[PDB]
Amino acid sequence: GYTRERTNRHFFVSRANAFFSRLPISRIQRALAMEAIKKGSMKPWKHTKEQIIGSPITCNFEYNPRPVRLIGTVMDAHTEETSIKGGLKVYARSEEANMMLWIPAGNPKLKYEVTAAKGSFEHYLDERSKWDEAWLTGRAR
Amino acid sequence: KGWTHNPGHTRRGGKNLAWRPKISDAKLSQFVPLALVHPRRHPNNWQERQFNALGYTKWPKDIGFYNAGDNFEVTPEAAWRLYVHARDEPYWGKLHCEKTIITLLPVVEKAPKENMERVLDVFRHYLKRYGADHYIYNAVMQAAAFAKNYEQAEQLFKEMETLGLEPNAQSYVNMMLAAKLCGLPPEKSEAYFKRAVKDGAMQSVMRMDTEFRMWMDQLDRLGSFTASSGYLSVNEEGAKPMPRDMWAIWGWHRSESKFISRRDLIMQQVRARVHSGKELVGTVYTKTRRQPWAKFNGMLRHDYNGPSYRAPTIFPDAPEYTNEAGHKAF
Amino acid sequence: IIRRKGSYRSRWGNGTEGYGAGVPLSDQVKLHCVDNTNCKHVRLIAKATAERFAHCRVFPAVAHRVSVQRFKGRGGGGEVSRHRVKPGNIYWVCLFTRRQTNTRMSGLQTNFDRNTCIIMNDQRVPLGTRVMYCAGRHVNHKYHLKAVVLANFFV
Amino acid sequence: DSFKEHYHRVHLPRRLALQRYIKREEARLSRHKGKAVAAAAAAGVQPGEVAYKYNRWWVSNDHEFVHQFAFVEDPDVTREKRNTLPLVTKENIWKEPQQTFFLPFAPFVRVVDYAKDPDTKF
Amino acid sequence: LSEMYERDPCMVMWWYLKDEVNRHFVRKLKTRTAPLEKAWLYEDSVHPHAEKNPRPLVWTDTATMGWRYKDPTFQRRWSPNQFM
Amino acid sequence: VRTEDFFSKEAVSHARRVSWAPHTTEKKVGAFAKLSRSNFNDPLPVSFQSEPYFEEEIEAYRAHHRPDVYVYKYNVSPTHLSLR
Amino acid sequence: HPGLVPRDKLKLHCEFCRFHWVQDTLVVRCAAHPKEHNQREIWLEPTWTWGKQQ
Amino acid sequence: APASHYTFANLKKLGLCAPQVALSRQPRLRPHVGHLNGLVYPLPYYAMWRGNHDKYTYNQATPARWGEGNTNTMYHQHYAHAKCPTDYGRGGREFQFLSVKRGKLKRKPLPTVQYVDPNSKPQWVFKSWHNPLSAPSMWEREVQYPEHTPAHTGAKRPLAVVAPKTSHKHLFLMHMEKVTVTVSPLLFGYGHTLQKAALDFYRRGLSARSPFPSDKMFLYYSIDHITPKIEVTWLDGSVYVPPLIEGVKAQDLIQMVMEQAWLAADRMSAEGRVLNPIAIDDYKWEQLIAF
Amino acid sequence: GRPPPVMGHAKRMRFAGVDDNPSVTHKPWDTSEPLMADYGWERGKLPKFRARSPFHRQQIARRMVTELIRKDYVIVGGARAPALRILADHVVELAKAGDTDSRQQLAYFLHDPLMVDKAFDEYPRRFRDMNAKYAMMTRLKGRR
Amino acid sequence: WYRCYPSLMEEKDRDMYHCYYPYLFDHGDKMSLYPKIPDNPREWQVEQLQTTYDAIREDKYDAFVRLRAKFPELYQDTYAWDNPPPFGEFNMFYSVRFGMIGVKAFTCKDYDDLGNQFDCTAFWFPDNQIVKHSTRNGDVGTDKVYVGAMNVPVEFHKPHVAAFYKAAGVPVKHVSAGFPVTPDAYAPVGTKLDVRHFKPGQEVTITFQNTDYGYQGVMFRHGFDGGYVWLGDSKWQRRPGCMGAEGQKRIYPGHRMAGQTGASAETYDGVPVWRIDYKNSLIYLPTLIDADVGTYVKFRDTINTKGYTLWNEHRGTPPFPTFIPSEEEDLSKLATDEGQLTSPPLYMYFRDEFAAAQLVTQADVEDA
Amino acid sequence: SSKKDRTFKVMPVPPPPPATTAVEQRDDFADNRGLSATTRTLSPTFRMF
RNA sequence: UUUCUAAUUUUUAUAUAUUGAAGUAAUAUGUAUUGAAUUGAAUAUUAAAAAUACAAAUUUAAUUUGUAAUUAAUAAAUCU
RNA sequence: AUUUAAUUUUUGUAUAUAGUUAAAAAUUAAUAU
Numbered sequence A: 001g002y003t004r005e006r007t008n009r010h011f012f013v014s015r016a017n018a019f020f021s022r023l024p025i026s027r028i029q030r031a032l033a034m035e036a037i038k039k040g041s042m043k044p045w046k047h048t049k050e051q052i053i054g055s056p057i058t059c060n061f062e063y064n065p066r067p068v069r070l071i072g073t074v075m076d077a078h079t080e081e082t083s084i085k086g087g088l089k090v091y092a093r094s095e096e097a098n099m100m101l102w103i104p105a106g107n108p109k110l111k112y113e114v115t116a117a118k119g120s121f122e123h124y125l126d127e128r129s130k131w132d133e134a135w136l137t138g139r140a141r
Numbered sequence B: 001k002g003w004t005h006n007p008g009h010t011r012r013g014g015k016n017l018a019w020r021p022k023i024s025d026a027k028l029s030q031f032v033p034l035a036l037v038h039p040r041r042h043p044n045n046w047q048e049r050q051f052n053a054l055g056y057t058k059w060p061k062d063i064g065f066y067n068a069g070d071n072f073e074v075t076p077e078a079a080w081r082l083y084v085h086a087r088d089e090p091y092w093g094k095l096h097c098e099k100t101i102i103t104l105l106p107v108v109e110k111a112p113k114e115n116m117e118r119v120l121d122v123f124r125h126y127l128k129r130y131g132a133d134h135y136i137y138n139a140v141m142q143a144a145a146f147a148k149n150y151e152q153a154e155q156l157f158k159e160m161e162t163l164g165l166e167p168n169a170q171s172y173v174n175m176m177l178a179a180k181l182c183g184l185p186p187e188k189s190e191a192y193f194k195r196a197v198k199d200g201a202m203q204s205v206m207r208m209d210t211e212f213r214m215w216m217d218q219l220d221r222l223g224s225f226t227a228s229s230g231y232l233s234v235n236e237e238g239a240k241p242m243p244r245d246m247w248a249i250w251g252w253h254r255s256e257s258k259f260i261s262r263r264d265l266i267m268q269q270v271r272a273r274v275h276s277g278k279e280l281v282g283t284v285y286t287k288t289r290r291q292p293w294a295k296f297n298g299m300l301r302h303d304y305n306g307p308s309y310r311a312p313t314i315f316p317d318a319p320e321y322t323n324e325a326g327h328k329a330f
Numbered sequence C: 001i002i003r004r005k006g007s008y009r010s011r012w013g014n015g016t017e018g019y020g021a022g023v024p025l026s027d028q029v030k031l032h033c034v035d036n037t038n039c040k041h042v043r044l045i046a047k048a049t050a051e052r053f054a055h056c057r058v059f060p061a062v063a064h065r066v067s068v069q070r071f072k073g074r075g076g077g078g079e080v081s082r083h084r085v086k087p088g089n090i091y092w093v094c095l096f097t098r099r100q101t102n103t104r105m106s107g108l109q110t111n112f113d114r115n116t117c118i119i120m121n122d123q124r125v126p127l128g129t130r131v132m133y134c135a136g137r138h139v140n141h142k143y144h145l146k147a148v149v150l151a152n153f154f155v
Numbered sequence D: 001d002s003f004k005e006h007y008h009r010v011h012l013p014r015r016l017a018l019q020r021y022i023k024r025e026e027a028r029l030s031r032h033k034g035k036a037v038a039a040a041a042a043a044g045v046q047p048g049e050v051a052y053k054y055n056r057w058w059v060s061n062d063h064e065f066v067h068q069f070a071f072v073e074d075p076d077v078t079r080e081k082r083n084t085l086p087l088v089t090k091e092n093i094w095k096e097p098q099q100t101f102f103l104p105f106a107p108f109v110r111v112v113d114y115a116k117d118p119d120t121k122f
Numbered sequence E: 001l002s003e004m005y006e007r008d009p010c011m012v013m014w015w016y017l018k019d020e021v022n023r024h025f026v027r028k029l030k031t032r033t034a035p036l037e038k039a040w041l042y043e044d045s046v047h048p049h050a051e052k053n054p055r056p057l058v059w060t061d062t063a064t065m066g067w068r069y070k071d072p073t074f075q076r077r078w079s080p081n082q083f084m
Numbered sequence F: 001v002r003t004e005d006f007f008s009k010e011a012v013s014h015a016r017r018v019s020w021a022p023h024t025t026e027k028k029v030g031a032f033a034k035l036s037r038s039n040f041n042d043p044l045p046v047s048f049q050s051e052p053y054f055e056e057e058i059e060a061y062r063a064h065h066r067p068d069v070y071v072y073k074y075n076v077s078p079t080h081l082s083l084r
Numbered sequence G: 001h002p003g004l005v006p007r008d009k010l011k012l013h014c015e016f017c018r019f020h021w022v023q024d025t026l027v028v029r030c031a032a033h034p035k036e037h038n039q040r041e042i043w044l045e046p047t048w049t050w051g052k053q054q
Numbered sequence H: 001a002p003a004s005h006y007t008f009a010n011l012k013k014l015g016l017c018a019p020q021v022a023l024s025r026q027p028r029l030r031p032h033v034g035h036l037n038g039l040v041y042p043l044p045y046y047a048m049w050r051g052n053h054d055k056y057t058y059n060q061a062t063p064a065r066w067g068e069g070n071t072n073t074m075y076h077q078h079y080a081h082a083k084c085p086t087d088y089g090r091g092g093r094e095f096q097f098l099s100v101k102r103g104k105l106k107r108k109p110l111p112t113v114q115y116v117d118p119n120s121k122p123q124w125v126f127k128s129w130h131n132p133l134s135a136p137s138m139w140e141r142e143v144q145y146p147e148h149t150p151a152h153t154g155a156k157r158p159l160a161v162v163a164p165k166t167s168h169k170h171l172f173l174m175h176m177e178k179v180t181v182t183v184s185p186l187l188f189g190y191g192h193t194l195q196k197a198a199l200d201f202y203r204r205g206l207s208a209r210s211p212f213p214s215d216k217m218f219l220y221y222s223i224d225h226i227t228p229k230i231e232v233t234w235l236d237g238s239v240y241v242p243p244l245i246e247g248v249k250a251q252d253l254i255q256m257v258m259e260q261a262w263l264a265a266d267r268m269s270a271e272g273r274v275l276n277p278i279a280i281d282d283y284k285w286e287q288l289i290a291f
Numbered sequence I: 001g002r003p004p005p006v007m008g009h010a011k012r013m014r015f016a017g018v019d020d021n022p023s024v025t026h027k028p029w030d031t032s033e034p035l036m037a038d039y040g041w042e043r044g045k046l047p048k049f050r051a052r053s054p055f056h057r058q059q060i061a062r063r064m065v066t067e068l069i070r071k072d073y074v075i076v077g078g079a080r081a082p083a084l085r086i087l088a089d090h091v092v093e094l095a096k097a098g099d100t101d102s103r104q105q106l107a108y109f110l111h112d113p114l115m116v117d118k119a120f121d122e123y124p125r126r127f128r129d130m131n132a133k134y135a136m137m138t139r140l141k142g143r144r
Numbered sequence J: 001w002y003r004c005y006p007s008l009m010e011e012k013d014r015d016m017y018h019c020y021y022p023y024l025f026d027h028g029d030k031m032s033l034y035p036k037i038p039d040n041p042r043e044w045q046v047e048q049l050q051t052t053y054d055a056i057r058e059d060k061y062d063a064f065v066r067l068r069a070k071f072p073e074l075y076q077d078t079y080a081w082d083n084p085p086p087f088g089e090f091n092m093f094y095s096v097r098f099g100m101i102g103v104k105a106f107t108c109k110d111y112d113d114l115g116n117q118f119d120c121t122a123f124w125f126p127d128n129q130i131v132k133h134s135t136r137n138g139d140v141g142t143d144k145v146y147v148g149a150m151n152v153p154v155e156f157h158k159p160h161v162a163a164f165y166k167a168a169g170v171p172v173k174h175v176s177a178g179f180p181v182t183p184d185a186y187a188p189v190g191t192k193l194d195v196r197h198f199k200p201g202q203e204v205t206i207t208f209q210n211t212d213y214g215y216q217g218v219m220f221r222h223g224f225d226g227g228y229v230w231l232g233d234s235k236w237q238r239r240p241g242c243m244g245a246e247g248q249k250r251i252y253p254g255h256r257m258a259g260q261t262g263a264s265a266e267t268y269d270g271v272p273v274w275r276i277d278y279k280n281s282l283i284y285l286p287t288l289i290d291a292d293v294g295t296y297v298k299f300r301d302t303i304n305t306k307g308y309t310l311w312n313e314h315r316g317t318p319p320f321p322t323f324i325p326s327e328e329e330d331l332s333k334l335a336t337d338e339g340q341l342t343s344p345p346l347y348m349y350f351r352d353e354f355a356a357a358q359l360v361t362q363a364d365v366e367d368a
Numbered sequence K: 001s002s003k004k005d006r007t008f009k010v011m012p013v014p015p016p017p018p019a020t021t022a023v024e025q026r027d028d029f030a031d032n033r034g035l036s037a038t039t040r041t042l043s044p045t046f047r048m049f
Numbered sequence L: 001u002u003u004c005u006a007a008u009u010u011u012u013a014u015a016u017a018u019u020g021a022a023g024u025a026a027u028a029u030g031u032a033u034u035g036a037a038u039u040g041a042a043u044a045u046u047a048a049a050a051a052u053a054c055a056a057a058u059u060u061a062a063u064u065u066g067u068a069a070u071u072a073a074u075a076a077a078u079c080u
Numbered sequence M: 001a002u003u004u005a006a007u008u009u010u011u012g013u014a015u016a017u018a019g020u021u022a023a024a025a026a027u028u029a030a031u032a033u
């Protein structure tokens, strides 16, 4: 007995990467991300610094009891523009716990409003050491 | 030494789904045909071996021949030649004689003059042996109807009362049929059927106007032999010296077979003609409940090697075997 | 013993790569219990051959030993009001959180500081009064919540 | 080639030549029935036709409803597809999103008359 | 044999020709099959060969007896052999 | 809550069933809709596993004392014909 | 249903215990005590073949 | 006019959950995903019983038990009158849960009622399951025409069609009113004759076993060589002589008159005679076999 | 499905599309970077001709660039050529920019100082109007 | 495969006493309740009651055809007895529309109204047109419609290929694949298919060439264990185990082994549809396929999903031959704002939390 | 064991013509009749002296 | 096993069924005796009593009822 | 599908109480001329 395991017909082997200039891919992803800032799922971002730290107040409308509101201290800024990635990675230090969690930033239930003017390269290091000391002394030893 | 990543006994080779379907033989076995009938299990060599292995005989066409329906018949003018020969026999009972007349019908409608004396000679002689009955009266009346001699049907009917014989339930149909095929309108058959309902000899469960229709709409389905409308108007017969399928059935199961060995046909006609102290007779109950499914089902000694070999019942036949014509269709 | 099979198709990954991510926390992983009990849970060893949230604490009732760190300090009579775990008892722990990126079907992926739990009895009745930690959304299932009464709030 | 593979690599172009024959003869029978009488037995009614089977709804030996599906594709209708242009699609079809989550069947007696034909089950 | 008959009745016949052509001509592959492709199996009478005029086969079966099923792979080690 | 099967049979033949329309107390419009308030039962005892074959039954009054009324070797009844 | 090793061992224990040809095998079937007094002659399975059960 | 599917709100209320036809982890039953080689139709499971393949499909001959593929050219007293020889289909497991054919459809028209004058409005008698088989409204016509109503006899409705078929041990007074048995002892015979068959029927009727009222049976010695007559008179007065065919005996006559007793009591119930409750139930209907 | 069908890491092949998928790993799929030690058969990497070590390969990238600048032709062999022409379009991308960051980012790379003294003078004059594809890769016929 | 086996009905017992409706015997000319009485009366077997009016059948059948007219509301579904479905019209159990070729274009993350994240691969349907209609000897169930894709210079195809499209009259298409259709789902050669041929809630089946991985060993090709890291294992970190058993001598065919690892024709059976940008001819699926961008991927329909037809009454009916947009309508006017279609909520409940059944309200939280 | 005997075994005899002689044409092991009963076709032409 | 040839021993031998005999009636030494809580033909043991035929059972806590009433059913006739 | 949950019917049956299913979980899809 035996088996092919590789299909090299002209339909499968051919690639459309040549003709792909017909499609304005990103100018779709713009408009694709534009139809999500319109529904209210997301609010624009143009920030490289001035966002490495802030103060989000997360409102994950988890149906568990009620919406969870966590004061946080953003430390990712994953994408730097209004596209689909988002990614805040807020630290959020709930009450006693330390929970580096990152919001996908497109989610309708996972909303959050950051405020600038605290985007300090100091206040960021304020929390990084706070999560570096929390990370280290949590291995249960 | 445990916990295989690949649980289960999916076998390696047997995957075709046509010659090995993945169906548990517990649920697949119920389709194995243990009563398999169409890819027949009786070759053509045997069809003649099992013929003679009953004691049956092969007659030339003129005497008789297994017809298109594989039902042995006797050819008229070969029927009368029996009654010419065995009328004196001690084992020529009552209903033997009338059966001769019924066979003389597809000629007495075709030869209404040369065969209307055979009917009467069967009639006239039947009275000399057995006093007088309805068999011979219903028959000869039916014969006189087919002869299109309606006046003879009336001339026979009025002798039933003249002999006290109350006109049988048929003695109206033999007349109803006569008044129809003889070219006479209704109200000559209707007035006959309405006689029957009152005397209770015939029974009609419907308003009397419609039963008489259902009667005639069976008596024109059975159109005369010389016409061309109905079943009797068909003259085609299957000329066959032996039935093409010697194991055909007329019931539900192989042991309800159609052709029975002479040496068992006799021990059947015995029990149907003796006291019936086990099975009741003349009743729609039939205590002997048919269960031809719960009976034996397995190939015997005689399902593989075929029927035994009993020498053909055949005649040295000194009469000359001359072939000197082709005869067909009466 | 929920396994996978590294075949470029079945692969645990590391978390951070979508739901049903990876690493179901094999037999002994020294959890850090957080009930209000004797368990001082610098250690509470795990003893069931799996642990996770996608692997769904909902179903398995993961038996866990207590590789005790066994108190901060206690005293009294010989036998007292039983909340004081013996150094070797086995309890069906209810895992709260993980140190591993636990993606959910919302793209939110949480990574906590210490992977904790709350000791529960054989009959899933929490052996503790309060809880000094958060707990991911994998609780709120009627499996344990009906006894895990919302000792506190979630994340 | 195995045994069964052989029998087909020999009989595959022997069954095609057989059915292509009958059709090629089916056109012959379709001729001498034009000038001939309405219809004989001739394997049915002897155009190229398919009679309808009113006998398709059975209740099996286990008392469960078994329906036979029979579809008779019309050779004249299909060619009437491959030429003409199909109609413009109704906007109430595509502008509507197909439901995802087919919901389970709910039993019901039809109207205030309890006919309902399951015979029961209670 | 019946479960093989569901699939193709002509195959039930072809399995047996193969067993009579491989009754002598098993030795070399060319003559194992080249006869087999000379017979034409038809589950019904209608066949395209009126143009060839197949002359009927005047032949009546010889054995009135039934067919024993003998396993292919049945070995007869010793024969009535006069030298016993 | 007997036998969770719950619509496991849902089937009675056109034969071996009786008729079609019941109703409980009300009428539709037909001015005669007094039908049954009927019951919902099990089909004839074990359907055909017991008796796979049935013999042809004539109407009752045509069944009991079925008279012998023939024409030439055929039995003509007001409804049935048969070659005796 | 205890295969009564020979056919001859078959005995009708109950009034309702009768014989039956369950596919070439003479067996005893009783409505009452349905499997309690049931006996089945020893013979090949109802659907055997010539290579599997000789 | 209900909705044949539960709604989300309806389904949610009970505490249940909507069945996923979606990305669920479940099997999402779709056999034929790789096995069915060719065009597969959106009929869910039409190739499973065959073995979940589509392989052969071209042969017309199949191992056919009674009443299957090519059995149609044989006479089997059941499938002769229970399957039109045309529609005979393929083998057992090769059932046709879906048969697709090519050609122009010919839908032959339905048949119409026979011996029914058009537009003749019939009175409708409604039957159903509810009726216990004892019910007279069960064994008779459903649609009662003026055509099938015998008027030569007094009838308000066409007579019954189906009759219960059971063996009667004893000659209980079902609805008869007087069972007279006439013989002529001038006729004689040793051995089983009709003289003996009718006179034991007198004993078998007068037996201490049969619940027949012993005082309602009348013997009648005749003179003029009257063949043994058995005459039963029903409540309506219509007398009935069970034909004493030769070879008959007690259990036949006790069976003839009792079987006819249901037909005759039916005809009395058709003319309009009110009927009584009957004690005996020769047809077991309220009984189950216990052990 | 929800996770990538092939999880975080797997080497596709030479001649394989990017098939972008949500992943933590970083892939350039673009190589606009000048004078870069990213040798590989991927997209964002120039062809890695064979050598004893990524160091010694870098040492071959030095004496084959400083000999193309020194004399404007170098008859280079095999997968060094597609790996060199991208280093001739980078040197001009280094010689055009001009700022003293670049003139060192080439000074670190050339074995000899006179070259980085040449490359910044002729090339701004030479390629002032050409904006890409500065190196012509014409194949000699007789294989070594 | 249990629960997949349909109701079993033996052929030997699909006879008169079974038929759910009145069984109809045809006579060649007209249907009738009774068997055909053969005209040659000799052909009748003895003792076979050739029925011509059966008061038991005729009355059971009188109660059927009359009561259907008397009380129509109740017997509506019994009208498919004599009123069969005509050909065309998208028979629910029969019709199978073709599929359209596609191109993987990019990937995006998309969320419902609920916060369910879907890794959405967006397929571009460049230019899909019927290039040729096929068959197989004009048989039944063997009818295939071929669909072009990606309008392309006549040079980019080999002359022997492009000389085909030039014969068919279609503009030469980069690639073409053959879909099986039921004959009532044909179209004219030269129909320009449009993405709305799929409905946002449908479930499509995609087939493509999953990304080549070279010649990968066995611990990658399949899942093989093997080799302790620092616990011995001279040279055995990844080599397979015993191949045969011992005595078969014949590496049983099907040993897993090392192999070429995945440049083959892959298939996802029942992936649903997420959006449709019918202005961009984009169709978004909530899944990740393992193919290089530009991998031509053909989209049939998923046929039956969990024992239930996809295109049934309660759950959407498709644009049957194919969606042909109206004459007033064109795309050069509108914008991506208006060209966007979306789906129903694929998942019943927000999936980070459980179903409303398992999550418990405060009422039981206050257990007391 | 031994090789299987793959020779060509002769075929069994055809059926004899029907009797229609009454000369005991059926008898097989009789002195008069040679075994073969081949009265085939244009055998009367093969008139022997 | 000199070579051409002729020939009498052949992977062809016979396989156990017809018949779920199931209607036909109040009784009567007698519920023997013994052992037995009880036992009446069917607990236990005991079994050659009688007369006007029906004691090796099912059934019941015991009985009565109720099943049951010593019968046609010839594979032998080899098949070659 | 063989590391079992929560529904829902815990009523049928009787000293405790069943049975189709569904959600979730064990996370992955496969075509040689």
Ligand SMILES: [Zn+2]
Pocket: G012, G013, G014, G015, G016, G017, G030, G032, G033, G037
């Ligand atoms: Zn018993």
